[PDB]
Amino acid sequence: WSDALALGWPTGITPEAKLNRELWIGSVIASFAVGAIVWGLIFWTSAFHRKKATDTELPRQFGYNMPLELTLTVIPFLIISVLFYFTVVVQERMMHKDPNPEVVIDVTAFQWNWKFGYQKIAFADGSFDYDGADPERKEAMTSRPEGKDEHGIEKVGPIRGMTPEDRTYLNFDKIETLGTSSEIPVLVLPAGKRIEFVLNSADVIHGFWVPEFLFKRDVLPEPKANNSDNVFQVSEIQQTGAFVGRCTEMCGTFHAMMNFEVRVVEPNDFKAYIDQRNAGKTNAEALAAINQPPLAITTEPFESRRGELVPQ
Amino acid sequence: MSTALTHGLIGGVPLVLFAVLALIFLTRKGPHPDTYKMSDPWTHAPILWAAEEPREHGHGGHGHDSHGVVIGGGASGKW
Amino acid sequence: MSSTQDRSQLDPEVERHTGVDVEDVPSAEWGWSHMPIGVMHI
Amino acid sequence: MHIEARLFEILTAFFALAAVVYAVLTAMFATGGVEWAGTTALVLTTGLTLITGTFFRFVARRLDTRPEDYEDAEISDGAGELGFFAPHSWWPILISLSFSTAAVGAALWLPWLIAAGVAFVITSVCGLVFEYYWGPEKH
Amino acid sequence: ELEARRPFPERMGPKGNLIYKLITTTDHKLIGIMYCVVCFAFFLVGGLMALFMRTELAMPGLQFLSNEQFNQLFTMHGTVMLLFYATPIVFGFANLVLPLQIGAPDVAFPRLNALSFWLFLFGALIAIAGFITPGGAADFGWTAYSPLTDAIHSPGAGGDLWIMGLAVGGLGTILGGVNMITTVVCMRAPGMTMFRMPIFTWNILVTSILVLIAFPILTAALFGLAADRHLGAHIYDPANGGVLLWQHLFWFFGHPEVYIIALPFFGIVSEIFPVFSRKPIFGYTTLIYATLAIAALSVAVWAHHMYATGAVLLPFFSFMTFLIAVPTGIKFFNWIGTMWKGQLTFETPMLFSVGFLITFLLGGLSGVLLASPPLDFHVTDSYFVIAHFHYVLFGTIVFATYAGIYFWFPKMTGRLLDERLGKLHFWLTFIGFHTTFLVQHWLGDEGMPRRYADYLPTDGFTTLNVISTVGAFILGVSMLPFVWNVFKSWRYGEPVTVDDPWGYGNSLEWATSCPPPRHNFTELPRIRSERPAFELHYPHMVERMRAEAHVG
Amino acid sequence: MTSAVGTSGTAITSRVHSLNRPNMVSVGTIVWLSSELMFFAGLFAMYFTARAQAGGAWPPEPTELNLALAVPVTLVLIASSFTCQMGVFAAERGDVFGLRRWYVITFLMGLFFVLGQGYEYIHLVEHGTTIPGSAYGSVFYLATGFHGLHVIGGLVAFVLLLARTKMSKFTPAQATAAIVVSYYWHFVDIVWIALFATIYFVR
Amino acid sequence: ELDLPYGSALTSSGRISAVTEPGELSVHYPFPTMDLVVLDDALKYGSRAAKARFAVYIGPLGADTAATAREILANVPTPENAVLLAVSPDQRAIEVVYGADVKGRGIESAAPLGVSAAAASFKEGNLIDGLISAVRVMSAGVSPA
Ligand code: HEA
Ligand code: HEA
Ligand SMILES: CCCCCCCC/C=C\CCCCCCCC(=O)OC[C@H](COP(=O)(O)OCCN)OC(=O)CCCCCCCCCCCCCCC
Ligand SMILES: [Cu+2]
Ligand SMILES: [Cu+2]
Ligand SMILES: [Cu+2]
């Protein structure tokens, strides 16, 4: 009954997702109760037809019921305040910002596909002496001694002294699971660990949404400069297997072709995968080596052809 | 799924529903009074109809006065 | 009131008796005022 | 115009409260302090309502109760010379067309078309404004 | 002792009696008619864009549309339906009856409202004109987020025409707000106090303020975007707060935009219930306060459309989003109270008016679900949101506007729209609507972000999409009975030779000939209460309307 | 055409008798100015967001505001508002020519303000700062140049009203037209005061 | 003096503002809308040639039918050039009356033709069609003043 009453909400795979699903179930129950009573009122006042027995006498013509108005403007405030309190307590576990993530994934989303960096890994049980690279974060300070003019301008740069073509906000890592247009990226994560996602956009705003995480975030170009808390954490992922993930903000024309996967594997599988990726290998090769289907099993890199009626 | 089935569904379900609703509603007696049958007596109040065809001097009512009926003809018949 | 009512005698010459009427086109007598509907249809 | 002014006074009070609370709760408890977009927008919509309500209040204090604003007013009380309301005019469509020309000139970055559209807008606004003041031709 | 009336009223009129009025018309009644006709044309044009989206989305493949062609469709469909059908038609209805409903002969600046309509029409055309360009119309979404709208992304001319088309159309909306607000403040009947003018006129008044507060921000933002696109003005550069600046600027306009689209039709629905329930609008003084509260709150709860961005004071906007739902709840309960213990007769205006209640509520109930950020996270930017604001818009500005059209067609044409065709049109619309969008809640609840041109067959919810397409084509054919009804009822159809074709009318617009005389009146009754026309037509009720009032 | 069906001296008269009832044109123009305030609110929001995201040195190194020239123009605009109000006082009277003098010198001083703004613009442009050259330059130019466009529109309104006063007899309607034009000019100078305090003093 | 049974009130000026319950109509004429339109089209432009106002009176005309026809023709806006065809099916009677100005323009010669056209259709059983035919024939007969 819960699945049907959830209105097609996938059963979460994280503690945060489970808690959000429970809040959604409660809020939908409240909304359906309110809707049921209001629709009952409407379909019961629809029983007040103009009865032919109604002689030349108009209705009670009352209007203006102050006590009833007060009651029906007090109760909605109570309902929405209870819902707001539940919302706040659930929100509190939206980004706990635990300063000790078990694996940090640098999710950089460029125009029409994804890339995952594996910035850092630090298992609580003790493992994964791994770290991000960051030699490639090179700035584009246009601080030339002189510009077109002969002297004086000594232009530094448009924005904070730099150029919009900066890309310094982007972070890069040794293990990059770049997603090609013909190969859906598959970010592989260890099961049972705390996974942080550091979110960024190379070109334009778009949205990282794993539907089974019951949570999305908007990867913006420069979240730090836009006062956006791009980085967000997930306490745990219980269920293993492949979970589809999608782009949920306008990217451009190929906004519907940015699907990726978040394949949750066991911690030992993650050990093997990261070792085999440190060794020169691709994501598909590492998946095959850890004995898991290499290509995204929940989605395909569907046709680059503009459509069905195009003549190939 | 079943491209032909989906096309036929989207093209036909609206048509079937439209036909059903038209049969339900358009086939209902309208508020327009039924045509007066000659056999039945004339129950409606007297009806006088006029063309409004020509220009009536000035539009304003005042000044028209009552020159008179000045009847200038006649006729009769019994169907 | 700084205007004088105009009056004009326009030299007339079809007698606008089979075609358009002043009720439909107020200035039928003042110029070419009706094209046969056959012309528009064809 | 007491109620007319009071509407905007109430709106101004609410918008001032909203701007103040937004500014405070954004200067603290936000990622980067004051948002500076919502804050400014709220402050200047408070200013919108404040200007309109202040003018309406000035008018209400300057005016004796009108039949419109007076409960228990007979129609004959307000009966009289209503002011000039513009009859038929074809200048509005010309103004709209001129502004559309300027707008397409801005969209398609055509400075010549922008200049032409601005000149047409000036001409059409002049026509609309002078429509009921142009005197008879002097010959 | 008998009158010489024509056997039937004049059907159309003499050749060349209308074309020159349209060009020169300074009559609000005719301008309102121009709004309604033109606005509906954009509804049909904008609605047709959804049928192409529906047909494409019925199957996982890209059968006949391209990724960018589909992207242009929801941009222009969302744009046309909101800014070229929904926002211009509130001033279409305002121009239609607002001077009538306050006893005024005309609007405050009647050459200005003529300009507003033409600014709407021509501004709308240049926005839709992005289609004729080879690149296409504006590909970015209707919201038109910042970096995607920069010259770097979406460099085509269609995107620019869209920006300027809104600027031109926006000005007409701003000027229209000046007329309605100035008309109400200044031009009023000798007895119509501010607390006795009808609810619709009050709703338009507060809506006009929202228009003045909101639209200028859009024009400022659009010029900033246009400056960025044409001059590289770094106004919305992401390194600045550009991405969150535009969203803050746009939604500060955006959310009031979805309420100027809502409040006027709350008045229309509020105008129709008392006349057909045969009793006063339940809680008149409460509705005007509810309307005033909604407009005050709508300005300061703009950012609840930006929960996913993770860059806004999340608790603040959620609280006021829950606070702005309460006034709309009061308004909803009052409408039921008006229907309560009333001699309801479900003519085509009530039928649509009641339909608004049913559709709006479910859309409203989902609205608070979106007001919760934790729920808004998963469900944001998905078809659940598409289903939310369609149950609310379509409920509020299709069901209610049709109720307004059906309610006020005699009062502007002198002819009655056929009841049977109206009932057919409603149930086609009601059955069609609930079909297309009800499943879209489930569609988006499971992973399916909106603005998706294609989806995989392996992805589920393929059956829901076809069900949605079936509903939209039921909606597609539902506009045929309406257009036929209006087409054959404007020139033919049962004439009304009396005021109030719907007896028990209020608001003083039913105190004049159904086709109102130029300058709206030959007879202004003694205005005493919120129901002048009812007081006039039923003097015996005058005492009762005061006696039974207080009990509630 | 005996004398007239409408016993009015002027074919154009006030929209409602202003002595007892609100001046409708004044109400409309005040509301529209309240809207233009929100337009400038959007511009101010852009400027303040750029200022917030600036890394300490809000006006970049290349840009240097010429307050020595920005203060004279601001004082000239204030004087323009004062003389416009004097013109309004003439308008309330039948002083057609007093109104014309006051509004002509108002237009001249507003034109001087526009020319001074253009001078500062070209000076800043040749000294690096330009709309595409910097975020500061772009927000500053956007705000100040939209205000400059509003000032140009005000000058156009002034000359247009003067032309209208030249073609028909002075009446309460035309005095009201002058009053609303003055309302626009006062709004323009007030938004200029806000922009000056924001750009040059607050910085 | 009494207004309509319900909902109609005399206004500040002479005009009476009436109302009807939402379901029903106002004209209540017992003829199809389309043939009402046809008869209106006849009266309107099939008579423009005559330049004399053509009027139709379906109501009863009792007592001396001719005289009642005269004093109902009196109600036509300009009886001077007017042609009133009155049919009473309560009496199966037809009476056509003419104004002084509409005399000698073929109106007198068209009276038997119009009456016969009305009578044939009426005995066939079509009141509105007979009225239309009579109007057409009479208007063809009359010549502009
Ligand atoms: C007429 C148009 C209209 C109306 C009235 C509303 C009304 C409301 N909207 Fe609406 N909204 C839109 C049009 C509208 N909205 C549009 C067009 C979008 C764009 C989508 C996008 O771009 O994101 C949007 C987006 C939108 C979002 C963003 C969704 C997202 O992007 O993820 C959210 C919340 O997050 C929201 C909330 C609300 C709320 C809480 C109300 C409420 O104020 C009113 C409705 C709710 C009710 C509950 C009314 C019924 C109340 C009662 C019956 C009283 C008793 C019941 C209770 C107390 C629950 N709206
Ligand atoms: C007033 C506002 C309004 C209205 C009435 C509608 C009406 C409809 N909308 Fe609306 N819709 C929006 C506003 C509106 N929408 C907005 C604001 C968005 C978000 C856009 C964005 O995020 O960018 C949206 C998004 C949206 C989407 C998501 C697009 C995507 O993200 O991929 C879909 C998908 O099916 C959709 C479908 C529909 C349907 C089926 C209707 C139907 O109810 C429409 C009825 C159809 C018709 C009336 C056409 C039938 C008529 C004819 C076929 C005759 C044609 C004749 C001529 C052209 C002369 N809408
Ligand atoms: C909507 C308009 C379009 C979009 C919105 C624009 C709003 C701007 C408003 C006012 C700005 C005025 C001040 C502008 C001057 C300030 C100095 C400057 O801009 O810097 C020099 C740069 C070159 O820089 P460069 O190549 O790098 O070379 C450096 C050399 N070393 O010139 C420029 O591009 C500036 C040219 C901009 C002209 C804008 C004209 C607007 C008129 C539009 C008419 C109304 C349209 C109605 C629309 C419905
Ligand atoms: Cu995406
Ligand atoms: Cu993307
Ligand atoms: Cu909102």
Numbering used by the authors:
A (entry chain K): 27 to 338
B (entry chain a): 1 to 79
C (entry chain J): 1 to 13, 22 to 50
D (entry chain Z): 1 to 139
E (entry chain L): 10 to 561
F (entry chain X): 1 to 203
G (entry chain b): 13 to 157
Question: Which passages does the manuscript contain on this structure?
Answer:
Telacebec inhibits the mycobacterial respiratory supercomplex composed of complexes III and IV (CIII2CIV2). In mycobacterial electron transport chains, CIII2CIV2 replaces canonical CIII and CIV, transferring electrons from the intermediate carrier menaquinol to the final acceptor, molecular oxygen, while simultaneously transferring protons across the inner membrane to power ATP synthesis. Structural analysis of the CIII2CIV2 supercomplex from M. smegmatis led to the discovery that a dimeric type C superoxide dismutase (SOD) is an integral component of the assembly. Each CIII contains two sites where redox reactions with MQ occur: a QP site near the positive (periplasmic) side of the membrane where MQH2 is oxidized and a QN site near the negative (cytoplasmic) side of the membrane where MQ is reduced.
